[model samples]
Target chain A: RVGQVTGLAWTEVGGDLLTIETACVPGKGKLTYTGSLGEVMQESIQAALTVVRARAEKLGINPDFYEKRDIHVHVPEGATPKDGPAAGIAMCTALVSCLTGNPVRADVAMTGEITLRGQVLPIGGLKEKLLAAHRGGIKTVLIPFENKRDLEEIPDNVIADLDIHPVKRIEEVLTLALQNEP
Target chain B: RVGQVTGLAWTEVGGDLLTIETACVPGKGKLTYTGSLGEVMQESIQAALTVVRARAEKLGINPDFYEKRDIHVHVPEGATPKDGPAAGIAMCTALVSCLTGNPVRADVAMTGEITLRGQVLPIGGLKEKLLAAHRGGIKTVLIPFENKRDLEEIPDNVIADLDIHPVKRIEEVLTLALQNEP
Candidate 1:
């Protein structure tokens, strides 16, 4: 339900510390944050909102959703807090879902950084994350196309168990996560 | 004379007041609130700008100030993020004063929220903010109407030295804080 997003986070590393919480609620939107996020991470969320705002005409969404919605992107667990660009794709997916009221598949997990133009930038951390996702029973994972090489580090059996997707733009991720094409 | 000014920012907890920079270029009016301000704060800036813009000549100012200005508000320390309606009063004061080169009383400080109509609304942390302001050498402070009770929280000696004005609108703040009736 809510605009809950999932991202792959690592501890001193990346063996699978799924933070399990990033959110966006779109109404008179402004990029909001909690969980003690850093600027780069906060900027990435705005980048997602800006892209959606700039592309509202094509997304089949109301433009008013930007100023008419106040988006909240909270990363839970503020005590031990950190933020990075790698969660960009998840943020975008969650934002799009919120605006269109389209439900994102709970089983679909995604990772990638996004730009104001919706380009999916390559992100670090895949091996440990993919392994963890497979073990966690996440059936579908969308990653940046540039991260294809990182996939080799994961055990073949693990990657095979998950429906791994290589995405190059936010559009592709949106197609994969939103139950219906937004 | 008509753009760019600096204001003070109180680190919400430590109450260590620091310089916050404000700039409005008379080019194309748009708000670019970087330095990682929260959404509500960003909206506050825009809302203030809009009301100021709509009521400019009535405020004894020019209306094109808005169309010709692209405001840039930056709170330097990205690590210590502060939000809410508290900074609202200071921002609008800095904004109005900038246009006329009315160097606001560096000795004065303000705290309040702005409504869609540019009315000053009450905010929290008044005691902490006022105590810090007086110790930091500020001579006057503008507070919201509802916070009239918070005055008792500050020592009379400190309050005695500061010209604390209870504000209900941006006009009152502008008139009281600006070097002249801006």
Candidate 2:
């Protein structure tokens, strides 16, 4: 619950929902990613881990958590191979949620490539992903701010069904997706 | 010196030597693989790490090494992309050498896929790899025992140039490739 986030993915067939699952276990700071990830996707998680580590203090995460624990990130649907940079922001959100003990909002789904400094970069297939989120009953969706232009091509009914938030930074996604202190 | 091993690789053009460099730093047991490895190659290293962990006691390596230090395995020729399971035994050997403080023999090069139980599995391009080891002036080479049948096709001069050892298990590779105490 704490270390999981809903991510938006684009496949050859169409856009789909992705569940980014993470767990923290006591050990050295080993980061493991499973679920048939391509090289780029695995490296994406590496970037996300660095982002989380860099902001550990501000995020209320233990500064030494990396030394005290191992982090594992898994994208389910094991049989189907997944690849690309679109899951970046969601990965960052999941890492922050797990380390900070915050639960990611179940109704939220997001897509974007995250840079080392937390900037959210544009991803492809915006319309398809929105349709997926709307069809999947996602109430809120975070997309790359740079991709805001693509929103015009999406149907009005599809846009009306979900609260779309264009995010240029990882902070925006975290703020809206993470369930903050009660 | 202890953590480095020479591996034979088969590229599209021809066979070449690979330098498997490893280092251990003080931190949690994080294994970092760099040098643009493909998914299969990355997974191969994962298997190698576990092999080292399984035999830590027998190898006279610290049982808590994984918890006390981070391990890095890097393949040089940064511009060249490398993939496949052929580097498995070499990766395992490098891990053991680094963890136990025993340097791998400089004259040896190896190729094989290592199983979790330490078996050395067959690999392709055996003839080409032997040619590489010979051309590199390496005095010794280790190959999978299952690949011994390929030796007949190798030129006699090339076979004579190097002392090739067919290994059925990781233990045999270590026995032939690692420098032992006097």
Candidate 3:
């Protein structure tokens, strides 16, 4: 698996595509995340890893992998300041993709806040996130189902051009974004 | 050489001792500086290296050392925001000390703005910089000769307790601070 995924972000000026990369190495269970991440975003990795661990067996990953391996999650553009819980799904997906040998679809981008039990929580800036995905050449987009109401404000052209799917759980996101094989 | 020297700094609240470290490795003529340095402070490294290069032969260092090796100048406390040209002399001293295999004296601390031609220039916060050096147990302090006038404002007891030298050039700083051998 590539262990990389595209996620959408809402910045102060506009939205942009965020590249999330993960590497799993043999070691004690230490989760390292880098690239100018702030406190809230650091907490997101912890939450995302817990979700991944909860469903490790179903995802075809070793349940006890955490004890024998260390995971490093990096967001590129090291100097860029990135904060918030919006990239939760992409972080979790990258970790799972690395462990299960399932590469995420290149044409897919996603954004959502994730809960402890794997529920896809609502995120802000739905219109901007969608526009960024479309501009970044993403064919399909995954969003929190709770953000569906906010989509009414998005321009019709953007919605028509991209296959935007709203999902309620992380499982639905996996089905849509993850490729069958490494 | 130890390749490390102590410098004085004035922060927003007060002042503290700054530790400057330089490590020379085999590579192209490249200079790498880390520890959250801002643009102005980064430029100071370039200026400091130029001073070192100008007097390389006199300091018993190879004139073409830059072409055969790479230099890495690191200011510790990675997250601390450090700026200004006051540490210019300290940075230059560290470079010369490392290249010459002569360590800088641990009990000596310096603060000054350095010119490309090796003239020691004036800097701000004389009282604070000196107080920090004195409190940090520095036996000798080097200040820019131009800043000698500013010393009139410092407390007499602080002045009487510490041996402070005003230097007009980088050579005087070397005479006062660097050890005889590595």
Candidate 4:
């Protein structure tokens, strides 16, 4: 069965919703790209892999994660231009979900510009990004701690069903995204 | 010759050109209204009288300036909503032109909100006001000193004939608008 997941990302213009789709392929594992991916986004995929590899050993998951699986991440709205370094954690979460054969919980959405040191930096468009997640039936959103003030502008009723988790680092994102694991 | 002087006033939205038409009326002095006058604009007319009256002694002009002449000030584009206190100085200049029977020099345009104490207060939309004056063939613009920084953004060529006079008080505006009596 095909598995698909959604995540939040931000660009210079505004926030956007990114969709990751995974499927079984007959031959060698390869990452395919679509929806006008930019250089920063492509690099985000690599950074995500490094983060997942470093943390996999502690989580008792396989270290050689990408060797056995092919992952494809595509953002919807192909006509609209999208470019940013903020999708690193979401891309990693999707890749890890596929590698472990664990279904990514449909309720969570996230955005953070990640550093090689596993630190998650705050992204812009906090209000519009969260609003997009809420409109798409998301129940929780993970943001960086520095973006806390933006939450004040959001209407209480819109966020009533949404759990906002502000994380300082990439490890905290994994702890919140994974289910049945601490 | 039928005399009409063009004046500029600043408002919340932007600046506008006001055409003040003066004609001989064979009756008591009356100020007739047209072109959708608002309460603030009506008050500005009264404020203009005070400034003109205070300056009349030093200028060797009549103190009871409005007692002898019927004056009419009309802002064009009547359908568009207009309201501001900034027209006080401009109205006073136009009234002076009519009372003294001196043609208002074609070069000068001005905008400054007036207080009951006969002081010129700073108003917003300095950039737009200047542009409007330039487009309407005004050679000089009198703005408040607080708006001096806005002049940096204006192109030198568009205002080649443009003289920028920053006024802190209503007296300064009168000195710029009136012809020098020798």
DockQ leader:
2
**Model 1: TM-score for chain B:** 0.84
Residue A132, model 1, lDDT: 75
Cα error, candidate 1, residue A14 (Å): 4.5
Alpha-carbon RMSD, candidate 1? 13.4
Off by over 4 Å in 1: A10-29, B1-30, B33-182
Model 3 lDDT on a 0 to 1 scale: 0.80
The DockQ-based CAPRI class assigned to model 3 is incorrect
Candidate 3 local lDDT, B82-150, one digit each (tens): 877788899999998888888688999999877554767788889988888888888899998989888
Q: For each candidate in the order shown, give its overall lDDT on alpha carbons.
A: 0.68, 0.81, 0.80, 0.65
Per-residue lDDT of A80 in model 2: 69
Which numbered prediction scores highest in lDDT against the true structure?
A: 2
Error of 2 at B148 (Å): 55
Better of 3 and 4 by TM-score: 3
Candidate 3 — which residues are off by over 4 angstroms?
B1-182
TM for every model, in the order presented, reads 0.50, 0.52, 0.53, 0.44
Each candidate's interface RMSD (Å, one decimal) is 8.0, 7.2, 15.9, 34.2
Q: Of 1 and 2, which scores higher on lDDT?
A: 2
**Order of candidate numbers by lDDT, starting with the best:** 2, 3, 1, 4
Quote the RMSD, in angstroms, for model 2: 11.4
Question: How far off is residue A153 in model 3, in Å?
Answer: 1.3
DockQ of 2: 0.04
lDDT of 4 by residue, A77-139 (tens): 332346677677787776666566666666888887888788888877777788888888888
